[PDB]
């Protein structure tokens, strides 16, 4: 280890268990705000259930963690600045580590699966580094997350549902502008559990909601420039066949000198929400995504609460 850390990269914790050790290694931050990325393959081809998750933070310099699974990983270096790529293959969101807002622990009987057929074979670890001292240009950090997986089948599934905004653009000066997302829910009952919502600077506000015969319910509001850990739903929302998952980010164009496209261009903003639900595990699948507005219609009854800055 570069940090003098003795723990292998696997422990195994019982006849079933094992834990894997996910650190940097021993990388130099020389800039505030720098993103460095690693990724750990999955020792078992099998499928395993990630069921809990410890954060090795330096408590100095790091901002976030956020642990991703995916198969084509940016790089196959020892690590790598972010800003080229997580996974050149969707990335799904695992778990987030926010040094301000604590991350919450999956619910009892939940675990994400990874390996196996339809699985990760691989984590990725992004370890964002925020202001770092000067004097620090030859300190070795291994920041990272010890994760816990079984290869017992869990009776719940987690995954992430994952709402984008690409359809919108936000004309310079305008006050507040709207991006909605909407998508028909059409598999087996997915239960929400937590929420975490992403855009860059403009971003003033997102929120998720579950409208089932013409009535919302909220699933989670958030402030994307608050740190971006999974906020915990209170009480989980279920979303079945036949519900619409609705979500509004607000931006503003105050400030700006052109239109700032929301989504693509991999350009200036973007709004994701994700939702992280949990399935029985015979139904469940690990992901899905909503990408348009199917009913832009319906924003128009939008309860007001959607409108409201988080500042
Ligand atoms: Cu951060
Ligand atoms: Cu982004």
Known sequence: ??????????????????????????????????????????????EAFVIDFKPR????????????????????????????????????????????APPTRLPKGVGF??????????????????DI?????????????????????????????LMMSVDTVIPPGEKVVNADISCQYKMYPMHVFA?????????????????????????????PQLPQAFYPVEHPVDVTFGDILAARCVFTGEGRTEATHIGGTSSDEMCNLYIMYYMEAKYALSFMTCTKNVAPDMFRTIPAEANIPIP
């Not at 019982?14 to 460095?36: H, W």
């Open 113 to 130: 699966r990874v390996g196996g057929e339809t699985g990760s074979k691989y984590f990725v670890l992004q370890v964002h580094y925020g």
């Open 133 to 161: 001292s000067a004097f620090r240009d030859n300190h070795k950090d291994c920041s990272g997350v010890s994760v816990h997986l079984t290869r017992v089948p869990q009776p719940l599934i987690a995954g992430m549902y």
């Open 1 to 46: 280890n570069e940090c003098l850390g003795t723990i292998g990269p696997v422990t195994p914790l019982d006849a079933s268990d094992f834990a894997l050790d996910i650190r940097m290694p021993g990388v130099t931050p020389k800039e505030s705000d720098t993103y460095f990325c690693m990724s750990m393959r999955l020792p078992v081809d099998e």
């Open 57 to 100: 933070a330096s408590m100095d310099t790091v901002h976030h963690m956020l642990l991703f699974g995916c198969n084509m990983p940016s790089s196959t270096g020892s690590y790598w600045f972010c800003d080229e790529g997580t996974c050149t293959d969707k990335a799904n969101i695992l778990y987030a580590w926010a040094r301000n």
């Open 195 to 223: 929420y975490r919502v992403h855009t860059h600077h403009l971003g003033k506000v997102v929120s998720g909601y579950r409208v089932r015969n013409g009535q919302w319910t909220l699933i989670g509001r958030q402030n």
